[PDB]
Amino acid sequence: VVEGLAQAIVKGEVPETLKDKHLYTLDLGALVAGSRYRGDFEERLKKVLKEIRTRGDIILFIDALHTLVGAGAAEGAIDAASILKPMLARGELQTIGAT
Amino acid sequence: SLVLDQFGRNLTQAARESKLDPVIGREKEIERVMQVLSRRTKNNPVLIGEPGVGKTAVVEGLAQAIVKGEVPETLKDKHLYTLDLGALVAGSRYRGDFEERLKKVLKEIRTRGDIILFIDALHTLVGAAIDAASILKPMLARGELQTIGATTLDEYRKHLEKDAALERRFQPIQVAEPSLPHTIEILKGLRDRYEAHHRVSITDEALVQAATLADRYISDRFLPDKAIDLIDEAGSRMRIRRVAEVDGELIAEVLATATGIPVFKLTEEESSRLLRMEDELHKRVIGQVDAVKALSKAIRRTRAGLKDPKRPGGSFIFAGPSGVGKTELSKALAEFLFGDEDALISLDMSEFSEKHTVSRLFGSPPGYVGYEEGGQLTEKVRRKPFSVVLFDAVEKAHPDIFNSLLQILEDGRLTDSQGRVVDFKNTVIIMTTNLGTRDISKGFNLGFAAQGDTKSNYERMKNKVSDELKQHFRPEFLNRVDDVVVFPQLSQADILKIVDLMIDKVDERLKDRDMGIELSSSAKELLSKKGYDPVLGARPLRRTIQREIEDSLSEKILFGELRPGHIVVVDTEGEGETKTFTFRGEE
Amino acid sequence: DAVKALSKAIRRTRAGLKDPKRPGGSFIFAGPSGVGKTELSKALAEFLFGDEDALISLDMSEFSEKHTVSRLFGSPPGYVGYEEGGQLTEKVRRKPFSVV
Numbered sequence A: 001v002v003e004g005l006a007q008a009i010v011k012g013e014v015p016e017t018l019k020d021k022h023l024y025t026l027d028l029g030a031l032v033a034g035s036r037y038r039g040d041f042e043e044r045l046k047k048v049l050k051e052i053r054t055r056g057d058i059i060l061f062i063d064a065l066h067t068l069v070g071a072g073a074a075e076g077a078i079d080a081a082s083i084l085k086p087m088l089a090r091g092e093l094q095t096i097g098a099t
Numbered sequence B: 001s002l003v004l005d006q007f008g009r010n011l012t013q014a015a016r017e018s019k020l021d022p023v024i025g026r027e028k029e030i031e032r033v034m035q036v037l038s039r040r041t042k043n044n045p046v047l048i049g050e051p052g053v054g055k056t057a058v059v060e061g062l063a064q065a066i067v068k069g070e071v072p073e074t075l076k077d078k079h080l081y082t083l084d085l086g087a088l089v090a091g092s093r094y095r096g097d098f099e100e101r102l103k104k105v106l107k108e109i110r111t112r113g114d115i116i117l118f119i120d121a122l123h124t125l126v127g128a129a130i131d132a133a134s135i136l137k138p139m140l141a142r143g144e145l146q147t148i149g150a151t152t153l154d155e156y157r158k159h160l161e162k163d164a165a166l167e168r169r170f171q172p173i174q175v176a177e178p179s180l181p182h183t184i185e186i187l188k189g190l191r192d193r194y195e196a197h198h199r200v201s202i203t204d205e206a207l208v209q210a211a212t213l214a215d216r217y218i219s220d221r222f223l224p225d226k227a228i229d230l231i232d233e234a235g236s237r238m239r240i241r242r243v244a245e246v247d248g249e250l251i252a253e254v255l256a257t258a259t260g261i262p263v264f265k266l267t268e269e270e271s272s273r274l275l276r277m278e279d280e281l282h283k284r285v286i287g288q289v290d291a292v293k294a295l296s297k298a299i300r301r302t303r304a305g306l307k308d309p310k311r312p313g314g315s316f317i318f319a320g321p322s323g324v325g326k327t328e329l330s331k332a333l334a335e336f337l338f339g340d341e342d343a344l345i346s347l348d349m350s351e352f353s354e355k356h357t358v359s360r361l362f363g364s365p366p367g368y369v370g371y372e373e374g375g376q377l378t379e380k381v382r383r384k385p386f387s388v389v390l391f392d393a394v395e396k397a398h399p400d401i402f403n404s405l406l407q408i409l410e411d412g413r414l415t416d417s418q419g420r421v422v423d424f425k426n427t428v429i430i431m432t433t434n435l436g437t438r439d440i441s442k443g444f445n446l447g448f449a450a451q452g453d454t455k456s457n458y459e460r461m462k463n464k465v466s467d468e469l470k471q472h473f474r475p476e477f478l479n480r481v482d483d484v485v486v487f488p489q490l491s492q493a494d495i496l497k498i499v500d501l502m503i504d505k506v507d508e509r510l511k512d513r514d515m516g517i518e519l520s521s522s523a524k525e526l527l528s529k530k531g532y533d534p535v536l537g538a539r540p541l542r543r544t545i546q547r548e549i550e551d552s553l554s555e556k557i558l559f560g561e562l563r564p565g566h567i568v569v570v571d572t573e574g575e576g577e578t579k580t581f582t583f584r585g586e587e
Numbered sequence C: 001d002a003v004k005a006l007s008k009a010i011r012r013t014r015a016g017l018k019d020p021k022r023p024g025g026s027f028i029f030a031g032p033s034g035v036g037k038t039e040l041s042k043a044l045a046e047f048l049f050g051d052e053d054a055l056i057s058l059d060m061s062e063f064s065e066k067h068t069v070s071r072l073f074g075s076p077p078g079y080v081g082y083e084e085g086g087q088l089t090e091k092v093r094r095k096p097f098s099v100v
């Protein structure tokens, strides 16, 4: 379904509200692949979310929402779900989930 | 108060600039809130209600009221701040910054002295990055914190009840679901904002029909939010197809394409179908005129709104002998009402002969294996709220199955081991049995019998079956069943009809290999004569058909006499008991 | 006749005269099927407590054999379901003002 949505967006059969929007599939594990030092995972996630906010014309796709609850949790590491919760509740980010 | 502003949200300022949804018809709970907040003990209020009723909307309306200055001087000059836990968690991973920023926040809170805090989703703060729970509890124990909380009823009873320390400091306020006029009022209030956002226009008829459709044909979600969802969804549909206008059939079809296939129209064409229901059913079921008539009458009465909306859409006890059409009628009903046989949820009760198997019906108790998975029936009903539930051979199950099953008959809702509630109001319940038909299956009576074998039939058989079943079953269970339908054994003439249907099935099996079969009237009469048995009724006919046709047809196929692209004509030879079948292959 | 008798009995039982060791009232309804027995009980409960849910109705047909009798009076320790009490007792715990 998301594949066909991307094909429709690139081909040009979408309403004018979307037109040229970029579907980016998130890649978990790559975010965690190097988060060993002080401030590595939270900073990466905040940076990517801020870049999405700055661009504006980006929409995210998560292929497994059940894996989102607990990604880089540690002695601290509030985790990715808590980071995503506030601005998702504020309605300033558009994401499509698949489970 | 830089720390306070960084880690808090002002509802009063937002109300001043009107960033909040309007509230109407909800002053009771806010009046209760400052009713209980003015006490000396248990001054901290907690709003208990089902999710979506608007507890957040409750505190938003409280902020609106305090901004409007409609509250006595006790609550005046008090700044309301919702504690933005997202602000606390965000950016806080320094080894010690967490709970220490909270220390600054709380010390500023007590220092200011004219402040009020709001805590939404109190479960994360009480009875739950985790040590923050242990800080607020002593603060409320001391008693100088005036906070307003909000919590779901099940969570409140499961977790907030056991916190004996805060039992003497919290007071509960219940919030009930809004009535349909209240929903209409809220829809009217949100009309302006939603029309401005969607750049469309909506009418009052759309509002009332959306509210009614949400109340009647949706059960998982709840009224004060799902009507808003439907109108926003319709507005999005009108926005994406291009001043736009939204009418009733528009939201009707949006709901139809949203969740399942609820009503899919409001015209009279489906009503004409319900007028032709008996003729439609008789294309799969042959000879059971009384059963089809009673079922059609009951479901037509249900469709007319003359039944209790709380109760399910129909309850039938199909009592009869073996192989008469008890399951074929259920399959035909499933095909007619929902377009496919897959809509029928069949449960063979022969696997529920032991009481401890009841756990597999609606899950296992907590703490045991298999708890993470739900019940095999409750979850399946939740997936498809519009389905026909069949309990095949209901008499072979343990009586605890009946104990659990009656609840569906009374209140149409079931609670599983996980505490969730599933609604059975949009389903048809059929329970099949062979009990009470021992005298109908065979009977000659003792003594000389006159010419007869024809009586009032349906009425006397129904009364006898009902009294026998209430002798064997619980009388209240039979009393609450919508209808008890007795299936008489098949006659001879209708058998000659059934043959045709069965032959058609065989023809389908020959369509895969590019073949076909045709029979003469004499062959059909011979098949009906050979396959007639008034005690069993239909399966012996199938055995006779298989033996006399497809045996000696498979042999011809294997031998090579019949090839793809051919038709097998079947006729009869001989007379009387010497009659036999003859097969001839042609192009 | 039955309504008058029940009214007189309720007057006896609610005048403060009979011993508190006795319950609120004890009645045996005998009659055929399809007559106003269950309806009369429901009306009595509705009048006394202002609600139709103030009626704990139990069928003794469920307890033909004694193995289920304890199910109505709390499970003794050591059973599969001992953590859950009997049906009759916990309903009185939830509401002592009801018609059994």
Ligand SMILES: Nc1ncnc2c1ncn2[C@@H]1O[C@H](COP(=O)(O)OP(=O)(O)OP(=O)(O)O)[C@@H](O)[C@H]1O
Pocket: B284, B285, B286, B287, B288, B321, B322, B323, B324, B325, B326, B327, B328, B329, B434, B498, B501, B538, B539
């Ligand atoms: N009136 C009928 N019209 C058409 N087919 C029928 C009729 N009665 C029986 N059959 C067919 O004969 C067989 C009888 O099976 P069916 O499911 O109807 O039995 P049943 O009445 O549920 O009996 P039981 O479950 O007690 O064995 C099926 O192949 C069914 O299609």
Ligand SMILES: Nc1ncnc2c1ncn2[C@@H]1O[C@H](COP(=O)(O)OP(=O)(O)OP(=O)(O)O)[C@@H](O)[C@H]1O
Pocket: B475, C032, C033, C034, C035, C036, C037, C038, C039, C040
């Ligand atoms: N005396 C009555 N006055 C009014 N309605 C009555 C009366 N008797 C019966 N009915 C009606 O018939 C229904 C069945 O009566 P009810 O349930 O009281 O019977 P019952 O004799 O207590 O039951 P059963 O003997 O079958 O266990 C009632 O719900 C009511 O609608």
Ligand SMILES: Nc1ncnc2c1ncn2[C@@H]1O[C@H](COP(=O)(O)OP(=O)(O)O)[C@@H](O)[C@H]1O
Pocket: B021, B022, B023, B024, B025, B026, B051, B052, B053, B054, B055, B056, B057, B186, B189, B224, B225
């Ligand atoms: N009294 C009301 N006035 C206006 N809108 C309401 C009211 N009650 C509920 N709503 C609407 O219902 C929606 C969901 O309510 P929500 O704030 O989620 O309640 P809760 O947080 O308790 O689940 C909100 O968007 C709100 O607009």
Ligand SMILES: [Mg+2]
Pocket: B326, B327, B392, B432
């Ligand atoms: Mg069957």
Ligand SMILES: [Mg+2]
Pocket: C037, C038
């Ligand atoms: Mg009775």
